[PDB]
Design a binder for this molecule. Structure first.
Ligand code: NA
Ligand code: NA
Lengths: 286, 285
């Protein structure tokens, strides 16, 4: 069994962060050690929530506890997404460093969440700086959307050719794999959702139809995309097959959500189409 | 169907919510995991790191779900191991608030106190909490032989006595009693046995004993309790509900044993949770 230490938010009702990624990743047959950074009643896009943020020192305490039972060496990858403060981020990188000492083959998959290209930045002060100068150099894979790829590089990205080159420039600072999870305006077609998977030797481009949720877009699509890519890569899937599975599995969860008229991403109702999607999307090697 | 599950969370391994959440979601029921603690691993390792959530955090979370008008979607509240009477009283306040939002909601109480062979493991305040407070508020309970004797104050020597004592606990609140581990009160020392009791009927079931040596895997009771609530919420007949739970838990224990693991292998055994290969037949008494 492959084992992921996933350090993300937890919501009691609904799905976001670890609450969006844990059940789909376990459904695919990979273990998830869910190290919850918060415990909130619901995600923040309802405009109100109750609960609490865990002390940043709690995150490194947990990791020490797993090392104390000599199980930290079983961790094959660390996954991070939304980060509420630079202090929390520094403790997540301390967890990554501790895991790699116990297991030198462990990967750090960083979703550098900063916001949606259509809405703008939603991160707390200092978090953008933390991703650019701290998380990026320590990462083995990163999954920036267009807004995050531009923030991390400090460059405008206008098309796929540029996105590949800019992704390869971020790679030189640390990660070996870059997933441009949301191309946005830099894509080929305005009527299509697009993603790009980049390595040193290759780049794959993939397309799928847009899902119009209108005013209330469900939270967790990025969290699910990042988590499912990590699972496919840990399971030894070729990069093109990995991208194709993620693209179709996420799309099917989104369709199920819209069909049920729900605001929350329906990760449990769509579980059969997560492992075996009906929809098939094919990547194009650039 | 939606379950608000208020139990422990362990980052590595499986106990409490970490044992029950994935299997119940695998069965197609939603789980709202209200974690009472966040620990590095369960306490039977003999050491752990992490913390206990403040008891007021539990009722704070329930209010937040009521604030988004979603508490009415809750079909059941599930509880297991409780660390203190204070945590316990906040769990019952959560149950009362859910029942106000949804009068058809059930409270499933696993009254954990200890193992019938290893003995009690909770403070006496917690045993008093289950007898005085948790039992009158429950709709279903899943005591092992030790817990069934603690709640009734009577010695239970056999299945006939177990059925009578279970119905005596029902007059005190619950409509369904699962004697999750019969222990010495069972018919056969060589069999693992359980009993499902209602006002009109009682079902008995057996399955082989699984030998794990000195280190007994944690969470068997948590998984049993969780999977029974799922079967009842999905409207399974009581005999079919007992048969599925008995076989699905056994399959998880078989997978754990064949892998030589200490942790209950709830993810590796996921295919046999929904569709067990083993078949065990319940007998109506
Ligand atoms: Na596009
Ligand atoms: Na027996």
């Amino acid at each position: 069994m492959k084992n992921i230490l996933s350090i993300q938010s937890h919501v009691v009702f609904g799905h976001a962060g670890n609450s969006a990624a844990e059940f789909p990743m376990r459904r695919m047959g990979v273990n998830v050690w869910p190290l919850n950074t918060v415990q909130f009643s619901n995600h923040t896009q309802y405009g109100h929530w109750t609960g609490c943020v865990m002390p940043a020192s709690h995150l490194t305490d947990i990791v020490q506890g797993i090392a104390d039972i000599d199980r930290l060496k079983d961790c094959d990858a660390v996954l991070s997404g939304y980060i509420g403060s630079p202090e929390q981020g520094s403790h997540i990188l301390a967890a990554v460093a501790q895991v790699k000492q116990a297991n030198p083959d462990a990967w750090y998959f960083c979703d550098p969440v900063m916001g949606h290209p259509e809405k703008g930045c939603i991160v707390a002060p200092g978090v953008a700086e933390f991703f650019c100068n701290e998380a990026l150099p320590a990462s083995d894979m990163i999954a920036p959307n267009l807004l995050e790829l531009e923030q991390l590089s400090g460059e405008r990205v206008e098309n796929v050719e540029q996105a590949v080159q800019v992704a390869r420039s971020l790679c030189a600072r640390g990660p070996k794999v870059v997933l441009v999870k949301h191309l946005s305006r830099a894509g080929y077609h305005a009527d299509c959702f697009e993603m790009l998977l980049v390595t040193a030797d290759d780049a794959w481009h993939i397309c799928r139809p847009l899902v119009d949720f209108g005013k209330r877009q469900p939270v967790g699509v990025g969290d699910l995309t990042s988590g499912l890519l990590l699972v496919n890569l840990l399971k030894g899937e070729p990069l093109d097959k990995a991208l194709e599975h993620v693209t179709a599995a996420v799309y099917e969860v989104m369709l199920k959500t819209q069909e049920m008229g729900e605001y929350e991403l329906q990760v449990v109702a769509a579980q059969e189409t997560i492992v075996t999607p009906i929809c098939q999307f094919t990547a194009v090697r650039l």
